[PDB]
Write a protein that binds this DNA or RNA. Structure first.
Lengths: 78, 176, 108, 63, 85
RNA sequence: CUUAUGACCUGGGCUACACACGUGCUACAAUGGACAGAACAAAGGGCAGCGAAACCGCGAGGUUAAGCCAAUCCCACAAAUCUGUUCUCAGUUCGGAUCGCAGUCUGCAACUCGACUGCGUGAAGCUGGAAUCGCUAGUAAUCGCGGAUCAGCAUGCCGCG
């Protein structure tokens, strides 16, 4: 996208604000590969669905500008 | 001539009080500058030896000398004799003037030159220059440049320790 | 040379400067718009007051090593953070989004 | 000093394009330089461009 | 000759492409259905407890705690106390 | 076959890639490249559909919006061509992939997985081995344009000069 803001789903913004308000906590199975990454997400570990499992991934201060779909290997090869 | 008066009147009294040597005889000097060429082209091309036989003379007019390798090396397909590279030795007045060409003129023509290698001393007080491209100063004349081999320069000082030869080159003006 | 690597002395003003890494055709036109040198003279035949104005515009831009760093910085950035586009830069395969059973012979 | 082997040695007047005039003794007589060390900005302490340019992005919220 | 049978049996890893019949066997801290893998540093068995390290990607390694690789970990937050189930 | 081989949802995949094959375009240049000037079509399409002019963005476009249910208005200023200017035979002022950054649109959403600009980067290739394929006159080749299909997407296929 260009100017509408980085896209988030309503469920993703919901539970991370529940996560950010008190303390970092357990991982979250997201089904939203489509969503972006906000700078509030740093240090929050979440589980991205790959096609057959939810793979847990980490978010640092460098993995900020991209979407969650950069961390879903959906096509394994050798 | 310019650097010697700079070295004698300014640089030598500065480092003398910096490390509290008991004499001017203890104040370290930088005596000789030896420059290796070391081209292994003679296995393939004996005519490529003649390039930088002529060309290194244009850098400093003291002509370099045929350096024959003193052991036959079959892994390089090389017999003993068989000249490999040339040797520019330089000590005295023009050599600080050669250093005047180095800092003031040469180094900005290294097209991505930055803070050069700090820890490239031999643990004695001597330094080597890592140069891979020879087009460093406006004599080089690109149209008369067929061979692209660089140049290896050795700094030889009278530094009794090492970490004040560190501080010697800073007062000389070696960038880091 | 200003870039530290030459331009050939007999080409025209725009196209000789396109050999500078980081500088292409339209980057050359914006410089010579500020220079105003009519873009067709022998670059063996200039003046340094004319060419000093060529220097500082190049000094203002990411030209020689800086543009060589930052894309290579980005390559070293995105591979070491996972980031699947990093793996496509990594393995020796295309990146921008293509098939795989077809040619792709720029990378194996 | 062997004659007939060494080329000549003449007092050079090294000049930079920014006006830095310098003196050596070389084979060639006049050396005209685009950028000398005193013209080179890394010798001028921090260079003006890449010291301020080498930053990472500020995880850019701006838009 | 039966050591040559051990030579000829190389091809039992060949049923570990194309998937294998796997349950949720490494229960990840009470949460199921997560991508984990058995650690090749040392094999995760019920001796000492088994801990999942959040990698940069490509899976989660169950490093079988009291391992020299799991003990020297930078970023101890990536270690997850998981269950052998 | 049937509380599943049926139905519903998310997300993945149909786009994988060590490698061969057909089938298509863009090229390897001087009958070319670049810039400027001048002039010339046929057919089809348009109601939540086309969108002029206008302004702003380097631009892709944005903005508002006349007019048009149409031989009225819009798509749409055709390209090759012609005439100048410059280029001078080399992996280059040909090549344009591959790739980085910066962008625009549609849409819930462009990561896998879209198109198109803007900047950069600039490889492979300098008429291709044996062998093969098309074509009897507006055809051969060549250059653009329209439409189905579609929110979106064509080097595809139809159709047009």
């Amino acid at each position: 996208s260009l100017k509408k803001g980085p896209f988030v789903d309503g469920h993703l913004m919901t539970k991370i604000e529940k996560l950010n308000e008190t303390d970092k906590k357990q991982v979250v199975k997201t089904w939203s590969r489509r969503s972006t990454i906000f700078p509030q997400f740093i240090g929050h570990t979440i589980a991205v669905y790959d096609g057959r499992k939810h793979v847990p991934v980490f978010i640092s201060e460098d993995m900020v500008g991209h979407k969650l779909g950069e961390f879903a290997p959906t096509r394994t090869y050798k | 001539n310019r650097l010697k008066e700079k070295y004698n009147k300014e640089i030598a009294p500065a480092l003398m009080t910096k490390f509290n040597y008991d004499s001017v005889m203890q104040v370290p000097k930088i005596e000789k500058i030896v420059i290796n060429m070391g081209v292994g082209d003679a296995v393939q091309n004996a005519k490529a030896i003649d390039s930088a036989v002529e060309e290194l003379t244009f850098i400093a007019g003291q002509k370099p000398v045929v350096t024959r390798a003193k052991k036959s090396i079959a892994g390089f397909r090389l017999r003993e004799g068989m000249p490999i590279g040339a040797k520019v030795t330089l000590r005295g007045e023009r050599m600080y003037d050669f250093l005047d060409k180095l800092i003031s003129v040469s180094l900005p023509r290294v097209r991505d030159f930055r803070g050069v290698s700090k820890k490239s001393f031999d643990g004695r007080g001597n330094y080597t220059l890592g140069i891979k491209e020879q087009l460093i100063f406006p004599e080089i004349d690109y149209d008369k440049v067929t061979k692209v081999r660089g140049m290896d320069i050795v700094i030889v000082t009278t530094a009794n320790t090492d970490e004040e030869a560190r501080e010697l080159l800073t007062q000389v003006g070696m960038p880091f | 040379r200003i870039a530290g690597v030459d331009i050939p002395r007999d080409k025209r003003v725009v196209i000789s400067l396109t050999y500078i890494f980081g500088i292409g055709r339209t980057t050359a036109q914006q410089v010579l718009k500020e220079a105003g040198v009519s873009e067709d003279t022998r670059v063996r035949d200039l003046t340094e007051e004319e060419l000093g104005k060529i220097r500082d515009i190049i000094d203002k831009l990411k030209v020689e090593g800086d543009l060589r760093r930052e894309v290579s910085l980005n390559i070293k950035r995105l591979i070491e953070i996972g980031s699947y586009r990093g793996i496509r830069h990594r393995r020796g395969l295309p990146v921008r989004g293509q098939n795989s059973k077809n040619n792709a012979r720029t990378r194996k | 000093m062997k004659a007939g082997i060494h080329p000549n040695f003449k007092k050079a007047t090294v000049k930079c394009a920014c006006g830095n005039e310098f003196e050596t003794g070389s084979v060639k007589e006049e050396v005209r330089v685009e950028i000398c060390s005193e013209c080179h900005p890394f010798y001028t302490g921090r260079q003006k461009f890449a010291s301020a340019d080498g930053r990472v992005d500020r995880f850019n919220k701006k838009y | 000759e039966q050591e040559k049978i051990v030579q000829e049996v190389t091809g039992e890893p060949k049923p570990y492409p194309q998937g294998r019949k796997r349950e949720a066997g490494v229960r990840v801290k009470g949460i199921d259905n997560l991508l984990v893998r058995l650690s090749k540093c040392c094999n995760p068995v019920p001796g000492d407890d088994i801990v999942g390290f959040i990698t940069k990607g490509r899976g989660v390694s169950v490093h079988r705690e009291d391992c020299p690789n799991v003990k020297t970990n930078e970023a101890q937050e990536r270690l997850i106390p998981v269950e052998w189930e």
